[PDB]
Amino acid sequence: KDYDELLKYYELYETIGTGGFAKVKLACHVLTGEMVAIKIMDKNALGSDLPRVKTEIDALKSLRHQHICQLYHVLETKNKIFMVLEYCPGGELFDYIISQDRLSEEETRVVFRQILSAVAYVHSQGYAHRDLKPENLLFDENHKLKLIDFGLCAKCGSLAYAAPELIQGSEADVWSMGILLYVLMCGFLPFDDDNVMALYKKIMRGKYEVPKWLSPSSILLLQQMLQVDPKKRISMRNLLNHPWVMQDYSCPVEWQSKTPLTHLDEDCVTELSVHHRSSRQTMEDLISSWQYDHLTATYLLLLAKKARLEHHH
Ligand SMILES: CC(=O)c1cnc2ccc(-c3cc(Cl)c(O)c(Cl)c3)nc2c1N[C@H]1CC[C@H](CN(C)C)CC1
């Protein structure tokens, strides 16, 4: 059905979630045996939103990072688009916050530093996410955060998280992270309403309830981030070494990628070459074209698998 080219490389399991655009399916890469998440999108249903998909894809191909969900493979058929992705079995941050009611300040800070690491890195590559919220943050197996959903990425998004300058890009991501921070620590939104007009007025007004359990430090950070005028809003630079962010850390936030593809792994390349019937030298030329085809998927999946084993050795 144009699924059958995909079934060459993967065997599909159950649907794990949906979004406006896409169905997400658990899958297994047959050759490596690695679990993956596959994002299936119908081009005909996408309709006039198709360019956002091509923005999403080009962005994910340019980002490689510990807190950004890795893309392994992009397949296009007549009707569908498939994105093969890192499987994050922990689910959304949103569900976690709800299971705890709210997070302790100390725990908020662990989460927040990983968000900041990912977000500062996204910016260092010239993007703005524009849809930061805890539905778009996932825990992988190690309980580490991965940022997802780059469809509104720019080189928009939910209203409750949207910056006032945007409802009428670096500064805007700071506003949304400000909203995130409120939710982690409080368990509800600073601006909420059943009426969008009422909600809009609350956002522009910029006044929210400050609960008793918050620290003065965190309160101040909130007001620095939740400045309505982007000019007065705190910059990313200063967020990265902010005193609250560093409380009880000798390490300010390391946003740089710990996972560049500096050079090719011998074990992985060797393994690839045997299956592919080519020498390691030939295979090294092939991999470096980086087409996010099946060769790319298999190399990256093999690398992901090696890294996992090496952590228990
Ligand atoms: C539920 C689960 O356990 C799980 C496990 N592993 C994953 C691995 C990658 C992606 C993924 C999803 C989207 Cl929509 C992306 O754009 C990207 Cl880049 C990755 N999602 C999941 C994943 N996501 C589900 C499916 C629905 C999606 C929901 N809304 C868009 C809010 C997010 C939650």
Side-chain angles (χ1 to χ4, degrees):
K1 179 60 174 172
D2 75 12
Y3 271 68
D4 282 351
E5 158 94 345
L6 182 85
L7 284 158
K8 291 216 220 168
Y9 318 111
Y10 310 84
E11 93 185 346
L12 316 169
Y13 294 65
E14 70 275 39
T15 289
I16 41 173
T18 59
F21 292 148
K23 186 145 89 159
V24 188
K25 293 268 266 138
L26 182 66
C28 191
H29 184 254
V30 170
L31 276 64
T32 58
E34 293 297 292
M35 295 317 291
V36 294
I38 307 187
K39 214 185 148 169
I40 302 159
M41 277 165 307
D42 181 69
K43 297 140 121 186
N44 302 124
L46 272 65
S48 81
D49 279 318
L50 189 148
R52 267 172 42 120
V53 172
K54 299 188 150 216
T55 289
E56 181 174 16
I57 284 183
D58 285 334
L60 275 166
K61 283 193 226 208
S62 323
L63 307 169
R64 170 61 177 163
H65 183 269
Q66 321 93 253
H67 294 297
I68 314 263
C69 182
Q70 185 63 40
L71 166 75
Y72 298 114
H73 197 170
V74 180
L75 277 66
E76 202 179 1
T77 80
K78 319 189 134 157
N79 295 303
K80 315 279 198 166
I81 306 197
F82 299 100
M83 293 170 60
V84 183
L85 295 154
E86 187 185 3
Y87 172 46
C88 299
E92 295 180 10
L93 175 64
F94 178 74
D95 290 325
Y96 182 62
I97 296 170
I98 290 187
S99 73
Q100 310 289 283
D101 288 295
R102 78 185 150 78
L103 297 212
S104 90
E105 178 186 339
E106 153 158 42
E107 215 197 320
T108 286
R109 176 183 295 114
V110 169
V111 162
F112 187 80
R113 284 172 77 96
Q114 305 172 75
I115 295 174
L116 202 44
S117 165
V119 176
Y121 166 81
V122 165
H123 290 183
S124 92
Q125 305 307 301
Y127 290 90
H129 194 261
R130 293 182 183 174
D131 202 18
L132 297 173
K133 54 172 147 136
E135 292 81 1
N136 285 342
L137 282 158
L138 301 178
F139 291 97
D140 76 1
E141 61 255 26
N142 311 111
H143 208 60
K144 306 228 134 250
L145 284 169
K146 308 284 162 152
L147 177 67
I148 62 139
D149 223 326
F150 288 89
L152 273 148
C153 187
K155 180 165 295 194
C156 53
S158 288
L159 190 49
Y161 290 80
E165 56 264 35
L166 231 55
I167 73 186
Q168 57 173 23
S170 166
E171 293 115 315
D173 274 343
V174 169
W175 167 279
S176 309
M177 285 195 283
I179 308 281
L180 258 166
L181 178 66
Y182 191 98
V183 185
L184 289 162
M185 296 195 292
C186 299
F188 48 87
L189 292 160
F191 314 101
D192 198 2
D193 216 286
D194 283 330
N195 190 278
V196 308
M197 289 276 130
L199 188 49
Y200 168 85
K201 292 291 162 205
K202 281 166 172 181
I203 288 146
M204 312 300 326
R205 176 133 182 261
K207 299 155 175 183
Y208 46 84
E209 157 184 336
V210 187
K212 295 179 181 178
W213 56 80
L214 299 181
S215 80
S217 192
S218 74
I219 286 177
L220 187 25
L221 177 49
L222 281 170
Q223 35 164 115
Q224 292 187 268
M225 303 182 73
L226 288 182
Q227 278 302 310
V228 173
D229 176 11
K231 293 179 178 179
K232 289 190 245 208
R233 201 174 301 151
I234 183 169
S235 63
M236 186 89 68
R237 71 186 183 272
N238 285 305
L239 213 35
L240 288 162
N241 45 43
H242 191 279
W244 181 93
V245 166
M246 291 177 69
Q247 216 158 289
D248 297 306
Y249 282 87
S250 39
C251 185
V253 176
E254 44 216 34
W255 62 268
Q256 290 91 344
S257 176
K258 279 164 200 182
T259 73
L261 307 162
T262 50
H263 73 302
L264 307 185
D265 194 80
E266 182 180 1
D267 298 324
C268 295
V269 167
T270 302
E271 187 74 51
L272 251 171
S273 54
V274 169
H275 184 79
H276 197 101
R277 291 177 161 180
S278 292
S279 80
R280 257 141 74 219
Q281 195 48 80
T282 303
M283 206 54 40
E284 272 167 28
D285 295 332
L286 293 186
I287 292 151
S288 311
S289 92
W290 292 113
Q291 302 290 286
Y292 285 81
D293 61 356
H294 184 50
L295 180 58
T296 297
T298 307
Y299 174 77
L300 293 176
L301 281 165
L302 278 171
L303 206 60
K305 180 206 250 185
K306 207 232 198 174
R308 182 167 86 256
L309 309 167
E310 228 155 29
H311 299 293
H312 303 82
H313 196 50

